[PDB]
Amino acid sequence: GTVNWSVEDIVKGINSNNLESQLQATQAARKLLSREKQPPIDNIIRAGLIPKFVSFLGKTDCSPIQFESAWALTNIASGTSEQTKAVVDGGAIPAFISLLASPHAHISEQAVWALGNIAGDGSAFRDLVIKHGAIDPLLALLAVPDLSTLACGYLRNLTWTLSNLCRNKNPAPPLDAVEQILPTLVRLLHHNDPEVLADSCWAISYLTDGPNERIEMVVKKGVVPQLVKLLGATELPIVTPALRAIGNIVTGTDEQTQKVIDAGALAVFPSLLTNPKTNIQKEATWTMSNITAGRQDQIQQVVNHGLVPFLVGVLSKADFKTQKEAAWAITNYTSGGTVEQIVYLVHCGIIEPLMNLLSAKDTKIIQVILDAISNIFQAAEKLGETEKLSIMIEECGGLDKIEALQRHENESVYKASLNLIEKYF
Amino acid sequence: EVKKPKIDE
């Protein structure tokens, strides 16, 4: 009966004075809006239906029309910002928050979903959802002794919505909303469902993408060990956000970085730095770059875990973007490391792959490599071994490349190159 | 994703 109605028919039913006729037309709208092929969102909006749907959310006596309207609005809210805005502008936010307490689980879940789409639009709607009081009722739905008793789909939707309330920057979510959410998030991060884990990690990744104070709020909750565990998961949808979270954390303080190391993270990098997914290798290498920017004792842990050969590996062969992160990781290591640590790097074979990357058409990577060479030469100067290095660089074709770079456009490039030639060749 | 439509139930 409610398959493939026209918008005109939906409108006629919705404007009837008959709740059952309105219910059938609302369901017909839900079915239109639930089709994967070009759902007619704008036509439904243009027909003026959103205010009617919103009013139906409040019909406690007709739970089916609450559900159908919720679903229809969910799918409108899933579209463009302008489509999401039409839902918000119809007063949907307070009406969905009221439904979070519905005795019908399918309706509460629909309201969770709709609020997730609203919040997911951006910081302003996220923050408006929060100001209307969404967080308390959302968290109340997860206030159970054991998360395993909840239906799987419902728990996944709640996790996803909460992740959207943690998402976006400029600004980041309200500090007090983050403090309120984090204890539930910590619990969900220990749940055994792969999709809940994935979304829980995304939420943590968002919360750690910011200044040191935001990182600290998360790290203080003791999640870093669980994140390192998830970093070793078999499911890529888990590894991706877990690694992003760990990566964000090591952009903080040397002390926040040490928690990642102490939790055992470095033992996972042999696999991450060889991972067949390009993006994992790239983000793992970026993570390493921010660990090598740390203290000498942290550099030493990188050395001890056998990770320098793996950096030589990525430098030698990887997607260009990963190779650029590896270049950074080396320049950092060389800027902060002791002489012995820098010697080790040369003994692992860093020179030839570094030199091969000097032929790249990226100015920034050339600057990075030139900086690293300078630091390595400096360490050799303290050992009286400048010539050994000069020879090495010459034999692998490096001197040729540095000469050319004296004739490079960029000022820093030609200067740093000239200095090296003048000082060591 | 950030937003998602409900397709079935």
* Main-chain phi, psi angles of A313, to 5 degrees: -50, -55
Contact A113 B6 (CB under 8 A): yes
Helices and strands (H, E) in chain B, number of each type: 0, 0
Task: Output DSSP code: residue A346.
Answer: H
Contact A121 B3 (CB under 8 A): yes
- Say which residues have a Cβ less than 8 Å from residue A391's Cβ, sequence separation at least 6: none
User: What is each CA distance from A267 to A153, A243, A272, A304, A347, in whole angstroms?
Assistant: 34, 13, 10, 10, 22
Which residues in chain B are closer than 8 Å to A106, comparing Cβ atoms?
Answer: 9
- CA nearest neighbour of A299 among A315, A288, A310: A288
Which residues in chain B are closer than 8 Å to A87, comparing Cβ atoms?
Answer: none
Q: Say if A77 is an interface residue toward chain B (CB within 8 Å).
A: yes
Q: A74 CA to chain B: closest CA distance, Å?
A: 7
* Main-chain phi, psi angles of A33, to 5 degrees: -75, -10
**Alpha-carbon gap, residue A383 to A397, rounded angstroms:** 24
User: Could you say which of B2, B5, B8 has the minimum Cβ distance to residue A164?
Assistant: B2
- Closest-CA residue of chain B to A203: B2
What was the structure determination method? X-ray
Q: B9 CA to chain A: closest CA distance, Å?
A: 10
Class of domain A1-425: mainly alpha
Question: Could you tell me the residue ranges of all domains in chain A?
Answer: 1-425
Size of interface A-B (CB pairs under 8 A): 35
Which residues in chain A are closer than 8 Å to B4, comparing Cβ atoms?
Answer: 78, 113, 116-117, 160
Q: A35 CA to chain B: closest CA distance, Å?
A: 7
User: Could you say which of A78, A106, A167 has the minimum Cβ distance to residue B5?
Assistant: A78
**Alpha-carbon gap, residue A74 to A34, rounded angstroms:** 10
- CA nearest neighbour of A280 among A307, A332, A317, A318: A318
User: Could you say which of B2, B4, B7 has the minimum Cβ distance to residue A34?
Assistant: B7
- CA nearest neighbour of A74 among A92, A101, A59: A92
* Main-chain phi, psi angles of A239, to 5 degrees: -60, -40
Neighbouring CB atoms inside 10 A of A22's CB total 23
Contact B3 A110 (CB under 8 A): no
**Alpha-carbon gap, residue A288 to A269, rounded angstroms:** 9
Neighbouring CB atoms inside 10 A of A46's CB total 11
Neighbouring CB atoms inside 10 A of A211's CB total 10
Contact B5 A33 (CB under 8 A): yes
The resolution, in angstroms to one decimal, equals 2.1
**Alpha-carbon gap, residue A147 to A138, rounded angstroms:** 14
Angle at A63 between CA A58 and CA A69, to 5 degrees: 60
- CA nearest neighbour of A416 among A381, A374, A384, A356: A374
Cβ–Cβ under 8 Å, residues A322 and A275: no
Q: A301 CA to chain B: closest CA distance, Å?
A: 36
Q: B3 CA to chain A: closest CA distance, Å?
A: 5
**Alpha-carbon gap, residue A137 to A156, rounded angstroms:** 16
Q: Say if A390 is an interface residue toward chain B (CB within 8 Å).
A: no
Q: A38 CA to chain B: closest CA distance, Å?
A: 12
Which residues in chain A are closer than 8 Å to B9, comparing Cβ atoms?
Answer: 71, 106
Token digits of residue A170: 């400029």
Interface test with chain A among B4, B6, B7, B8, by most A beta carbons within 10 Å = B6
